[PDB]
Ligand binder design. Structure first.
Ligand code: HEM
Ligand code: HEM
Ligand code: HNI
Ligand code: HNI
Lengths: 146, 141, 141, 146
């Protein structure tokens, strides 16, 4: 997981335009719609019975903000992702019992959401930079599992 | 399995793609080669750089196969039979790569179809692409 | 698809396993938990201590389902229908984990079947376990 | 890779009992039998038309032994697999055009072959250590792809 300087610049430039709260809710929502087995982790969030019930679920949306906040924070530490995500890795393993495959799924859903929001601006080179990022984040979140 | 709603959603979204099918197929391939460099191992004989006639031509082939699959959405194993034979006996692409191309097709569609790429439609398209991929890897062994 | 030769190989190999199936199921689970610790995320409610009776109980259930699938090798989707429902709607194990358990099942069989685990039988067993996995994830979405 | 001191010892001990002619031929042979599409990379090896033909093929057997030779180098330098396999990673990418997903397939076939030979001696903890090894080798061989 090594972005070039130009890729780092591209990632930072695009992220400045992201509504992190909105995008987080949308990414977590689409994860739960597209891969509905992932709803297993969110029973407490209430109604997840239809795509609209999931996407507009306020608890899903609020949780998406946390997720994207932590992601946003990781973008500031692209050369130390394992360290950045170490305590969250331990938490997702020990307390939450979340299969890290879910981090890979969410990363690619987030890429879809960025493409949906940005359209043509989400160019193939911009995507490739973000793919390095989401793979690095997923790998970091998996790293302290045991 | 594709539900009645999945098939409605796929037909509507791919129909909206319309004349752009070949362009979008080539864009998805480009996105794949840049995002997932291991996929380039299957194309040592191609120019893979931007604007490649070979990538454009291949994108059109891929897109046309998807159009045929949509047309025969209830009989994909048979409609894609010759193509699955080619994949199993000649191309021999590891199954993981189909997930990479599928994802890049979703990203392409998302980038071009703001109103149409809803969460439900995204779900149906992913299922559809996985179903096509399953058929194309079904005869490997 | 499982060929007649695959079906022959699988029936012969599992027949040899016989009453050891439950023990081997538990062993495969233990191998999986140690080799691929992420799989333990599905068992936080289990006692995972050494020689766990709860793990052994589970190994028996897994093994018994496989014995049934072998006995119904011509129509696995039907034989495994209720189990596939439970996987899709309750257990909801990510599909990647099935490959991990399948590999650990092969390792277990290899370790216990010195004569029977030929290259051809290895291939047939791998296809069989992948087919079972496909049926078990078939209703996920 | 991140093998514990005790796993490093266990891997080394088992490997000192490995017959490389037998294990190397069996591992490469079974890759080509179990995942027959991988035969695409070995057309020059001649007759690969049946399992017996693959397993008995002198070039498959010789090549499998060469492959294990490289694995042995890995096992002798577990803290720098990426460095150890850099040259071979470049070769497999640039000259051979081998999708690295195949490295994972070979790794797990090797684990099956070790289990088949050693039986009960290939204990669950020994397997777990070898899974770290083969994942590490595959990841190192994949590292210089571009
Ligand atoms: C970019 C990847 C992810 C990041 C950065 C992330 C971050 C976070 C953060 C900051 C929290 C709050 C921690 C706390 O409560 O102390 C959290 C909680 C949680 N996460 Fe993740 N997460 C990610 C992916 C996922 C995925 C894909 C899933 C499952 C599909 C998941 C499941 C959970 C669950 C179940 C909680 C607790 C929810 C609750 O309070 O009920 N996470 N995550
Ligand atoms: C993951 C562990 C692997 C290791 C340690 C390894 C090691 C090697 C070595 C040492 C060579 C000889 C290089 C030379 O002559 O300088 C080689 C060649 C080669 N490898 Fe691998 N390899 C691995 C996996 C694979 C896989 C999985 C494939 C394809 C499915 C593959 C395809 C090839 C091919 C086609 C050659 C050239 C054979 C020829 O001379 O025609 N390798 N490898
Ligand atoms: C990363 C590799 C890769 C993937 C995932 C992939 C996925 C798919 C998918 C999945 C949605 C579809 C519908 C599809 C369709 C096609 N592929 Ni793909 N192909 C792949 C690598 C190829 C290669 C390689 C060729 C040959 C290209 C050439 O011209 O040499 C190919 C050729 C084809 C052709 C042309 C066949 C012919 O000559 O009749 C079609 C159509 N395909 N490919
Ligand atoms: C890594 C996780 C995992 C995998 C890959 C997996 C793979 C498989 C395979 C594939 C060959 C088979 C045949 C199989 C069969 C079964 N599983 Ni699995 N299961 C898994 C995690 C579970 C869990 C968790 C349960 C619930 C256990 C409990 O007792 O709470 C389960 C429950 C079952 C049961 C009991 C169902 C019931 O209550 O009626 C059977 C039978 N299975 N599981």
């Amino acid at each position: 997981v090594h972005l070039t300087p130009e890729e780092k610049s591209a990632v930072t430039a695009l992220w400045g335009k992201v509504n992190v709260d909105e995008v987080g809710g949308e990414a977590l929502g689409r994860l739960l719609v597209v891969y509905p087995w992932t709803q297993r982790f969110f029973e407490s969030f209430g109604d997840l019975s239809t795509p609209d019930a999931v996407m507009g679920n306020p608890k899903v949306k609020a949780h998406g903000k946390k997720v994207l906040g932590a992601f946003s924070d990781g973008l500031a530490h692209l050369d130390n992702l394992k360290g950045t995500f170490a305590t969250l890795s331990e938490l997702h393993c020990d307390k939450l019992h979340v299969d890290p495959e879910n981090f890979r799924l969410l990363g690619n859903v987030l890429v879809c959401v960025l493409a949906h929001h940005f359209g043509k601006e989400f160019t193939p080179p911009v995507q490739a930079a973000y793919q390095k990022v989401v793979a690095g984040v997923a790998n970091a979140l998996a790293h302290k599992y045991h | 399995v594709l539900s009645p709603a999945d098939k409605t959603n796929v037909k509507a979204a791919w129909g909206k793609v319309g004349a752009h099918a070949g362009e979008y197929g080539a864009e998805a391939l480009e996105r794949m080669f840049l995002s997932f460099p291991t996929t380039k191992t299957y194309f040592p004989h191609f120019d893979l750089s931007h604007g490649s006639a070979q990538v454009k031509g291949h994108g059109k082939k891929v897109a046309d196969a998807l159009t045929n699959a949509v047309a025969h959405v209830d009989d994909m194993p048979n409609a894609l039979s010759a193509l699955s034979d080619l994949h199993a006996h000649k191309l021999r692409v590891d199954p993981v790569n189909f997930k990479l191309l599928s994802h890049c097709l979703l990203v392409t569609l998302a980038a071009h179809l703001p109103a149409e790429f809803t969460p439900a439609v995204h779900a149906s398209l992913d299922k559809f692409l996985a179903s096509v991929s399953t058929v194309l890897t079904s005869k490997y062994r």
